[PDB]
Amino acid sequence: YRVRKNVLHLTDTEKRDFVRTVLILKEKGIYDRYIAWHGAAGKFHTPPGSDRNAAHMSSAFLPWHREYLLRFERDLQSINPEVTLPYWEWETDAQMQDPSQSQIWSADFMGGNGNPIKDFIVDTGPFAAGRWTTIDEQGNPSGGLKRNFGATKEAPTLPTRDDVLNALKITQYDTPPWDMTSQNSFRNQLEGFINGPQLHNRVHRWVGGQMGVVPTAPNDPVFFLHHANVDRIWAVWQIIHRNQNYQPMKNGPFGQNFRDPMYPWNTTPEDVMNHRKLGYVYDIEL
Amino acid sequence: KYRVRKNVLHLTDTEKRDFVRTVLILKEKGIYDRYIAWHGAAGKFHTPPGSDRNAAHMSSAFLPWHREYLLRFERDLQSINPEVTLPYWEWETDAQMQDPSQSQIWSADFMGGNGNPIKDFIVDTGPFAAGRWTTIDEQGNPSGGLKRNFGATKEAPTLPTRDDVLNALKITQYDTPPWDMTSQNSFRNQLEGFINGPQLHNRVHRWVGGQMGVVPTAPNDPVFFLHHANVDRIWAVWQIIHRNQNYQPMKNGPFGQNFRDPMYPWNTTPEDVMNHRKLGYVYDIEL
Ligand SMILES: [Zn+2]
Ligand SMILES: [Zn+2]
Ligand SMILES: [Zn+2]
Ligand SMILES: [Zn+2]
Ligand SMILES: [Zn+2]
Ligand SMILES: [Zn+2]
Numbered sequence: 001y002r003v004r005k006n007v008l009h010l011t012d013t014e015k016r017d018f019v020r021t022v023l024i025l026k027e028k029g030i031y032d033r034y035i036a037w038h039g040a041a042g043k044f045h046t047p048p049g050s051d052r053n054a055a056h057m058s059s060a061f062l063p064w065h066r067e068y069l070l071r072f073e074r075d076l077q078s079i080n081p082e083v084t085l086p087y088w089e090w091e092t093d094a095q096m097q098d099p100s101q102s103q104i105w106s107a108d109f110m111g112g113n114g115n116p117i118k119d120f121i122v123d124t125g126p127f128a129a130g131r132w133t134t135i136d137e138q139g140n141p142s143g144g145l146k147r148n149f150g151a152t153k154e155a156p157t158l159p160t161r162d163d164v165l166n167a168l169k170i171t172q173y174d175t176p177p178w179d180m181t182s183q184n185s186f187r188n189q190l191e192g193f194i195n196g197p198q199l200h201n202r203v204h205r206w207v208g209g210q211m212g213v214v215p216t217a218p219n220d221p222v223f224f225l226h227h228a229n230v231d232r233i234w235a236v237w238q239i240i241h242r243n244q245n246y247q248p249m250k251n252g253p254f255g256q257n258f259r260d261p262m263y264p265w266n267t268t269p270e271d272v273m274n275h276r277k278l279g280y281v282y283d284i285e286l
Numbered sequence: 287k288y289r290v291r292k293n294v295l296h297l298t299d300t301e302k303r304d305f306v307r308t309v310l311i312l313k314e315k316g317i318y319d320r321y322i323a324w325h326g327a328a329g330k331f332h333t334p335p336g337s338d339r340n341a342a343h344m345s346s347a348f349l350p351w352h353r354e355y356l357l358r359f360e361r362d363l364q365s366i367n368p369e370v371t372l373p374y375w376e377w378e379t380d381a382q383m384q385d386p387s388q389s390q391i392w393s394a395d396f397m398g399g400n401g402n403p404i405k406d407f408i409v410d411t412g413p414f415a416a417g418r419w420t421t422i423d424e425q426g427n428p429s430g431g432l433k434r435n436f437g438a439t440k441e442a443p444t445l446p447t448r449d450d451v452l453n454a455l456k457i458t459q460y461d462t463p464p465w466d467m468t469s470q471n472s473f474r475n476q477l478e479g480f481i482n483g484p485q486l487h488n489r490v491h492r493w494v495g496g497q498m499g500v501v502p503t504a505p506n507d508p509v510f511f512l513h514h515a516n517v518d519r520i521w522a523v524w525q526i527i528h529r530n531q532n533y534q535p536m537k538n539g540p541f542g543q544n545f546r547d548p549m550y551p552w553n554t555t556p557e558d559v560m561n562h563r564k565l566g567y568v569y570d571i572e573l
Pocket of ligand 5: 325342343501504
């Protein structure tokens, strides 16, 4: 099936085609759908007055994003059928002396860190301001992609391989009360609220700029590379604990159970439980 | 072309009780709120960004979008009770009344009455009265109870008429460029209510007041759906009268406004809902 590859193993040509396909999606008005859907789920609380939302801080975090990526990728392939979504393996970059030296940040791919004299506006790469129009929380143009690697003092480093390995050991998908306080929960740990920010959250913070905030995060195309890695880690977790399943199955908040629709779609967690049936694998499976 | 949408005033007592019962179950289950959020979400999705248009309002997709919105809503009613369809509030008939607050739509067995002035204009009668029903703000958080204040503004002290509707139906083009509020000689713009407005659809929102008066919160009032069934019926009428005209723009409009563009927040295109009969429903008038 479709193979999702480590960013570091992409050809320069596979690289160029992905960037180019993302630019075509932006130009068409399609990319903005993804920014919007994500901000909208972020405001949709399950139940209202609570601190879970459709896409974060609860059991749906993982399948929600798997669905998001699947949809994103099909759109990619409507433009170019040879393109799949790659993943950013940040736990290896965390190894590098200077993470900000990773080739993912090359001018030919995601482009670079922000310019501190311009308020951390990004001015190298295909998504530099003037080449890529971002949208503020309201749905209007915002003036340009920003990034500020490792500057947030609580998230100065990327997650390590050991962080990923320790998460892979948790036997449970998730526990009550199915939120950011869930303990011994693979979901809450991979998401990063288990004494973090760690893993998923930590990467967001580390990148800074739009990636640092929920409502604006997907303005940075690297959002999708980050999330493919989270999805990958979940896929590996499911392979290991083959007899473990999504929790909760029932009785949890509406929108959070195995067969509830995940706003803003009708897709349920159960629809996306098996990634191979969605048509794709990660190169490591292989 | 079998499921039948009936005029509110033509519903039996059984029908009214069962429609209200279904809406209350939708709410409890958590499904109704998906509808409030969708509408809000679309209100903020500008086509294109910066523009005055959005996915659901002030442009060509206004009609198809709310048609798709209602269809999804109906499907969910029917998953609670397959006998239940979405009725329409024929407001142009209520507009004749000396006091429209006395329509049966506003009865305690159906939509409940007007806001209570003594108490910040909160609805205190009907199944949707404060304490019986909880509203939700633009932010996605609990916002107290329902509010209405009929005709409390000078921009819209009255409900559109029969003549207003008739004027709209005469119009030849579904819509005209630039496919926004400034469109002229356009059925869509006129119906939505921006031509020498606020009139028709907009006017009605303003007439009711409370949450119905502002885009992001309007669907907290279940009357929002009765009103839009009426808007959709008028469109369905216009499509028959003008059997030689189609939707606009077919192409080269902003993305999300064209005939085969997906309508955020769904993948549904205007084309998908152009013929309401093929969607499995008619209005009691199309007999
Ligand atoms: Zn939480
Ligand atoms: Zn997110
Ligand atoms: Zn995220
Ligand atoms: Zn509007
Ligand atoms: Zn509306
Ligand atoms: Zn409306």
